[PDB]
Scaffold this active site. Sequence first.
Site, short mmCIF file in Angstrom:
data_model
loop_
_atom_site.label_atom_id
_atom_site.label_comp_id
_atom_site.label_asym_id
_atom_site.label_seq_id
_atom_site.Cartn_x
_atom_site.Cartn_y
_atom_site.Cartn_z
N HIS A 95 0.88 -1.26 0.00
CA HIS A 95 0.00 0.00 0.00
C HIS A 95 0.88 1.26 0.00
CE1 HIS A 95 -3.79 -2.22 1.09
NE2 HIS A 95 -2.90 -3.08 1.56
N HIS A 114 -2.51 0.90 12.12
CA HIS A 114 -2.20 -0.47 12.51
C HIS A 114 -3.43 -1.08 13.17
CE1 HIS A 114 0.23 -3.77 14.07
NE2 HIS A 114 -0.40 -3.60 15.23
N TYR A 173 2.45 -4.47 12.05
CA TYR A 173 2.29 -3.00 11.89
C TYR A 173 3.03 -2.21 12.92
CZ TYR A 173 -1.57 -4.03 8.71
OH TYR A 173 -2.33 -4.52 7.71
N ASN A 191 -9.84 -3.02 3.50
CA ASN A 191 -9.75 -2.98 2.00
C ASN A 191 -11.09 -2.80 1.36
OD1 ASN A 191 -6.89 -3.41 2.00
ND2 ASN A 191 -7.03 -5.59 1.53
#
Lengths: 726, 726
Positions: A101, A365, A388, A174
């Site tokens: 990303h 995260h 993350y 997403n």
Amino acid sequence: SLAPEDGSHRPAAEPTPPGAQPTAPGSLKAPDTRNEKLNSLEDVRKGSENYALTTNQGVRIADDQNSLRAGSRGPTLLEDFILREKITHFDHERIPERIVHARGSAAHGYFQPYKSLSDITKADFLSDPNKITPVFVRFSTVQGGAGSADTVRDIRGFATKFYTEEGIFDLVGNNTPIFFIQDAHKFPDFVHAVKPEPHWAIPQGQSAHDTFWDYVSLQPETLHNVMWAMSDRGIPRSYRTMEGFGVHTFRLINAEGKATFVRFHWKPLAGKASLVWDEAQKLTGRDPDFHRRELWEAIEAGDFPEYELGFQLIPEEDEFKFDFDLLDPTKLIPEELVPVQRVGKMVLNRNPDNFFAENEQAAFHPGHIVPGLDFTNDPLLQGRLFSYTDTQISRLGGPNFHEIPINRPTCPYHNFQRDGMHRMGIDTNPANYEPNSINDNWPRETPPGPKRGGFESYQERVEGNKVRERSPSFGEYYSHPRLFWLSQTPFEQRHIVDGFSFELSKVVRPYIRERVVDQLAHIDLTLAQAVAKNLGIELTDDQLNITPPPDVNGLKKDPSLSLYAIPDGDVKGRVVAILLNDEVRSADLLAILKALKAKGVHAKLLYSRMGEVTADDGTVLPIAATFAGAPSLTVDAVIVPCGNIADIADNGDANYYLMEAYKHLKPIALAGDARKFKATIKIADQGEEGIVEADSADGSFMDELLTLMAAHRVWSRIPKIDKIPA
Amino acid sequence: SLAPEDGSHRPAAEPTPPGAQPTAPGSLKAPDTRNEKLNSLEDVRKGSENYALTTNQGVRIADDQNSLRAGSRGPTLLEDFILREKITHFDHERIPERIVHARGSAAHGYFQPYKSLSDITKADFLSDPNKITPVFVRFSTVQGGAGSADTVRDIRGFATKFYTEEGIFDLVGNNTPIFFIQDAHKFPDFVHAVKPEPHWAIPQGQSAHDTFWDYVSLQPETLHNVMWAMSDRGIPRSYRTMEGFGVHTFRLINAEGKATFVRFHWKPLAGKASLVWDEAQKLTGRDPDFHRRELWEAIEAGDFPEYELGFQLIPEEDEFKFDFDLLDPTKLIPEELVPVQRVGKMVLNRNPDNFFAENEQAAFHPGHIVPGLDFTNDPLLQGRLFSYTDTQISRLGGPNFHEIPINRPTCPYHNFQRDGMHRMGIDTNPANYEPNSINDNWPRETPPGPKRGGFESYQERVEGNKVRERSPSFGEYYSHPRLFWLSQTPFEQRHIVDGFSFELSKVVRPYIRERVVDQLAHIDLTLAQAVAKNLGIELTDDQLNITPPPDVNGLKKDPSLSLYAIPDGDVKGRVVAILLNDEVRSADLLAILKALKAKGVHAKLLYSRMGEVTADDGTVLPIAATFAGAPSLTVDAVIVPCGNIADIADNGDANYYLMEAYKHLKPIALAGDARKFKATIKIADQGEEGIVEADSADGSFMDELLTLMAAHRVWSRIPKIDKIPA
Ligand code: HEM
Ligand code: HEM
């Protein structure tokens, strides 16, 4: 003084449509749009007007055009500390991009719940419909680097940082409701297979290559999210017109300690809309920044992206009541089985000031949860929780990334953590440990409670041996891909077949194409046969006889899985190209422009050169772009007013503009003599659905065109385009 | 989960044309291609076949598909060190990209001089025609990130690392003979102006935006390199078909201590060739990796990139004999005034094994010179010598970047420097300082001398006061842009006007457009009027009366500045598309392939689906790509053999293929019944130069097409393409 004396260098600090003014930092374009996070960033915002240029040490610079040298043609001297500071800073401007990303575009906004959800969660931000939570949202693609193109075929990320009164909650989702893989241990394998191949670093932004499809062919768990990527879900029109999903089942925990399973959804209030492949691919060349641009310009226009948060809730007693496991992130929960309950609305209404400082350094995260939320044992989610925080130590330079301004909580944060690179906070506590007596044990632990309490994990029972083992409940791969396929309209299915066909054509080893086609045959024989036909592959008798996977809990379709089966069109914030001539019929243009304005649809006036043209009645029309400068790819519809049509009738760019719009299923409207363009796109005299034509742009002409726009594209045209040379 | 039984997963380790086999790491594709640097990397090359999968600590892994959990539906355990090592490595894979030239493609090769140059330089690598020096070359664009597109309009970087016996020499050049700015202090200003604008980070890979044109309009020293960028030099067909230049004047120093000024040139032995703008910009969307792929594939095919190193030499006593300052990097030295003397040949003959480890981590820096070379006081070069060692501290993680394998010298290196992050070398010297007695002062300094001597700077006289001041001799900005403009062919001038017109049409603030047109009026009124016309601007009477700048030392033109005025075409390594039908006339295909093979020109066989088609004689033809999958943008010429032309006659994609190729001035050849396609591109019965046509493909037909290809494009067709809707 280099600015023009007329002040035209500076955009108006008011909402303005795309292209009317230069874009600007959000705090200069919309100074009166505020929220608690944007106000808290005032301590670090730096202006510029009226200040002297200085080094970073505050020393004023007299000559910022020259290095210090011994003689004006002599060597540069080491004692030039002003040159060396400027160049040192420049030399170290770049930080590592995100591992995935890396290409994303972000904006500020706010969220508010519709009602208190205290019956199902003690989360403070969902407790009160009058409680506003600032947000920062980043939308992204997955595979390509930070300088890759926006309108690739890919999954999109949709990440939201909620700056709550009880901590930052990041909802890192997403635009499809599942993921490609089941267990985090495989994430580096999957990502390495979709990313550019390691010998030569090709292809950027594309899964259309051998290693992606090799992995897919060998790991059928991936087929459900590959179906979504191959559909038009993989090529959204804008970040405003896609759905969001948290993918995993999480838990909500109420003040009585009851856990409810939840999956998170975002519904786009602008509706769902996607491009078609040839248009998307072409647009990655004509404007690789199209989604980032569209987002920024929609916010500057006041066409704020709005989304409704929704929850799918399943009681703890119903964990095992479905044909699929709730903890498997390759499975979706059909809305026909479990409805999405509306929870609140998010509005993104201000762009950042500095993309690097705010977008590039933002850290989201999914482990960032707050009391009232908890995790589940989804084995993909479980590994995400490690990644993350780890990745920020290199990306953002150390463990103090929460002190970068964009990432800072707006609520209090105090603990006994110290030091690290880039330490901003100067702790004054005599103690840096607990328990301590020397500071009376502050800052102190807080017990859990209904409000403002400490975090405690839900006491889920764990029972089993320490194993590296996939649950048998996860070992089903084809039924959800099939449910998705059967839920699409016939034109969406054609676009899915064309997606797989194009991608597999770029796979150089033919046996991989054959292995993919065999997987398709386990999902739906019609799909597999249509892909095989485009690849010149014949299915074997064994493949023709594979029995289809079972329905999902009795469903053979669910229309909420389609982008278009249920109309949810919204024209506001869309854009139409108006192809001008050198003596436009001004009455047509008045009628066109005022009708678009009334529905919040923007216009771009195009011609064969820049500057101005003059209408029949003398009105001076400013030109936004040329036909080649602003191709039809960048608009939703095309309108040609009357006037001196001979001026543009033989302009190859004008003709091609209409051919390309026609191919890509866009509405087209032709007034008056502009109907001579019908021959270019081969329209019959009596007309055709999708082409609006009349003597003048009055009467029902604009209503008809706007009705077409609300349905997005003219799907009925697909068999017609099939042989147009464009 | 294994290889196919026929071995088709693995490319033949022999030279193969593009598309015939999957691409592969260089050492597996061309295991017998060696040089001293390639060999030296054997210590770090890692294989894979027959080895067990392990952790980075060498522990064999039993299950790489699952995380360790408590029960197979349970939570992941923190003691899973195999998962955590794999995901930690993944989470830290990215390093910062280069501040500029982040997008680049590289290969290994070797250089040798044609004759000893010991009369003018003591540099060892130029001393012996039979002593070969390995090289590593990276070509790049300037503005865009590592994930941006290849065929943007931009300057290109051409950086060569020579691994000499007396040290690494890096010749860090671009594809135009000048740069945009005069003094390194302005480098961050210029770069920031051309890079994506700071509020929203748009546009990627493009100078077509306000801040770049603002900076140019306010700093006329940029105009020369802007003229080059707006010409077709800004859009090369391949890195094999562009020139290279060191830009700065440097010095050569011979064994008697004599200094000669020098500028460095690379001449492409494949000839000079560029795209046209519409093609380039569309190809950024259809194949953003077009140049990277073409370089790798040319090397795999044996079409090795070759370039001739050349020197312009000026004696020290002639420093001031021109009407420009030799130390001003915005001025070129016309070849009519100082010829390029041929010095040697460089051949790139092997691709890397891993792009990250070799290309991404390579560090080139123009301060890496060797005895026999020296610098001058050019104020841009002077500042570059600071930046390239500074920037590696963040990009490559510390001061030991020379121990990263691709950067290591292949000659000895020994000194008293020690430590630093990820120190590889273990020094055994009991001393880490000099002078020392405890190691008898080793390693020792070496006096300068004719060969194998220590470096000493040429003792240039320096006389001046400490000033931050531009030399007055650098304050002329229009004569070199004018010489460039007058040296272009008419079609090259048209493309320059189009490039400025396109770019300034995308500048939102109109006064910036006006200011750039006023600069153009100081170069050439025909250029300025043609750009102003496209922008709807009228020159004022004062602008029409600006006196043209002077000729450069009496020159009205220099044809070596044009890409195309002097024929230099080489068709070896070019590619033709062959549009198949379902019953190809095999005698046409035989003749076409035979003629192409004899000239080293590759073919790609295209159709409307993938798989195979059978020719009239039973020959089974595998299909490389569909018409849409590999558009005409990707080839140099299109041939359509006879056969069952009705199969493709009405196919929109095939007709469009020819219309796109026609618009982009590519040769087209049509045999037999394929001549019915003449109607799609409006060719007269009598024919047209640039369209080869005949009853059959044969010797005469192919010789004509091949003659067209040697001239690259069909410039005479330009007036006929404005009407074409494509
Ligand atoms: C449900 C499946 C997943 C979803 C929905 C998802 C979503 C996302 C999104 C949207 C981003 C971009 C954040 C931003 O905009 O700044 C991201 C970043 C990232 N994710 Fe995931 N992801 C998934 C799986 C995984 C897995 C399995 C791992 C590794 C165990 C992983 C590790 C990472 C890392 C290292 C980053 C970069 C974050 C940063 O540098 O700050 N993700 N993820
Ligand atoms: C004649 C003018 C210049 C030319 C021809 C030139 C050429 C290049 C090239 C070709 C590269 C890419 C090398 C590669 O492939 O890795 C590069 C990178 C770079 N240049 Fe320059 N350059 C110029 C001016 C400057 C100036 C004025 C500065 C600053 C003082 C500068 C600082 C840098 C830096 C920091 C990099 C990235 C280096 C790295 O990370 O390894 N350059 N330059």
